[PDB]
Amino acid sequence: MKLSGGVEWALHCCVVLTAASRPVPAARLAELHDVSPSYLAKQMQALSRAGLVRSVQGKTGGYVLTRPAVEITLLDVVQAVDGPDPAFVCTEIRQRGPLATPPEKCTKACPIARAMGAAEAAWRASLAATTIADLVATVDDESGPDALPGVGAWLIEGLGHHHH
Amino acid sequence: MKLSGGVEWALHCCVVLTAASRPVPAARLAELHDVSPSYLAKQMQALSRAGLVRSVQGKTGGYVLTRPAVEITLLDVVQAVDGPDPAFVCTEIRQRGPLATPPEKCTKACPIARAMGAAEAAWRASLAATTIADLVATVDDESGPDALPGVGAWLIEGLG
Ligand code: FES
Numbered sequence: 001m002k003l004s005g006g007v008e009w010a011l012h013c014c015v016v017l018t019a020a021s022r023p024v025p026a027a028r029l030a031e032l033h034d035v036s037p038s039y040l041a042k043q044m045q046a047l048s049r050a051g052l053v054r055s056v057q058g059k060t061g062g063y064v065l066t067r068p069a070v071e072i073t074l075l076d077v078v079q080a081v082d083g084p085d086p087a088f089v090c091t092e093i094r095q096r097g098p099l100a101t102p103p104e105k106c107t108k109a110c111p112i113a114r115a116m117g118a119a120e121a122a123w124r125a126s127l128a129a130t131t132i133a134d135l136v137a138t139v140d141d142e143s144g145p146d147a148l149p150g151v152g153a154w155l156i157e158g159l160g161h162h163h164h
Numbered sequence: 165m166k167l168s169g170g171v172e173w174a175l176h177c178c179v180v181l182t183a184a185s186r187p188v189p190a191a192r193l194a195e196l197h198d199v200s201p202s203y204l205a206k207q208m209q210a211l212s213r214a215g216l217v218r219s220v221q222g223k224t225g226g227y228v229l230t231r232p233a234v235e236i237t238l239l240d241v242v243q244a245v246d247g248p249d250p251a252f253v254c255t256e257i258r259q260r261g262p263l264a265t266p267p268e269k270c271t272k273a274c275p276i277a278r279a280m281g282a283a284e285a286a287w288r289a290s291l292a293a294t295t296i297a298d299l300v301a302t303v304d305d306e307s308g309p310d311a312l313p314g315v316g317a318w319l320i321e322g323l324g
Pocket residue numbers: 090091092093094095110111112113172176
C-alpha cells in the first residue's frame with residue numbers, strides 16, 4: 001500500500017489554515033511550502049469535495065476551513081484525499097469454486113474478513129481520535145506558541161508579502 | 165487506500181493448507197477458488213519469497229506450509245503479498261519554503277508523521293496479534309470441525 005502523497009500536504013495545509021483569520025489562496029499556500037500551485041490546489045479541491053475546506057470566491061478570496069480544527073479528524077483528511085475505501089474488501093471468494101459455500105449459508109461475514117476488519121478498525125480508531133486541533137497543540141508545545149500564528153500572518157499578509 | 169486482491173486469496177490459501185496432510189498439487193490449489201495457473205504462480209511466488217509456503221518436488225509433489233499455523237500471523241501473509249513498505253511516507257515538507265524548520269530543529273519526526281505512523285502501527289499490531297491458527301479455530305467453531313478437513317481431503321485426493 002501507499003497512501004496518496006497528497007495526504008501529507010493536505011494535513012500540513014489544514015494545520016496552517018487554523019492560524020489564518022482570512023481566506024488564503026492556493027498560490028500563497030504553495031509558496032509557503034515551495035511547491036507547484038496546481039499540485040497543491042488538487043489536494044485542496046479534494047478537501048473541498050469532502051466539505052473540510054471551501055474556496056471563497058471574489059476579492060480577499062481563497063481557502064478557509066469549513067469547520068473548527070477540533071472537528072476535523074486525521075481520518076477525515078485521509079479519506080478526503082486517499083479515498084474512503086477500507087484497505088481490505090472481501091469479494092466473497094468462499095462463494096467461488098467447486099467447494100463454494102452457498103450464499104444462503106453466508107449470513108455471517110468470513111472470519112478472515114472479520115479479522116481484516118478488526119485491523120482496519122484499529123487504523124480508523126487512531127486516526128479518528130486525533131484532530132487538526134491536536135496537531136496544532138503538539139506544534140505549539142514543540143515549536144512554541146508564536147510559530148503557527150507567525151505562519152498564519154505570513155499566509156494572510158497583503159501587500160507587505162512582497163517586501164521581506 | 166487498497167491492498168492487492170492477492171491478500172484475500174493468500175489468507176484463504178494459508179487457512180486451507182493447514183488441513184492438508186500431503187503436499188497440495190498446484191492444479192488443485194488453483195481450482196479451489198477458480199484462479200488461473202498464472203494467478204496461482206504469482207501468489208505462491210509471494211508466499212515462497214516470505215518463507216510461508218514451500219514447493220516439494222516429485223510425483224506426489226505440491227505446496228505445504230513451512231511452519232505451523234500458530235507461527236504465521238495475518239501480518240506475515242499481508243506483507244508477503246502487499247510488501248512491507250510503510251503506507252505513509254513523510255517527505256519532510258516542513259523543511260521546504262521561506263519559513264522552513266531548519267534541519268537542526270528536526271531531531272524528532274514531524275508531529276503529523278508521528279500521528280500517521282502511530283495509526284499505521286496500530287493496524288500492524290492488530291494483524292500481528294492474530295494467527296492463521298486463530299482463524300482455523302474460528303472456522304472449526306462456526307463452520308463445524310469437518311469443514312476444513314473436508315477441504316484438505318479434496319485438495320490432496322489422488323484422482324478426480
Ligand atoms: S470470503 Fe472474503 S475474506 Fe474469506
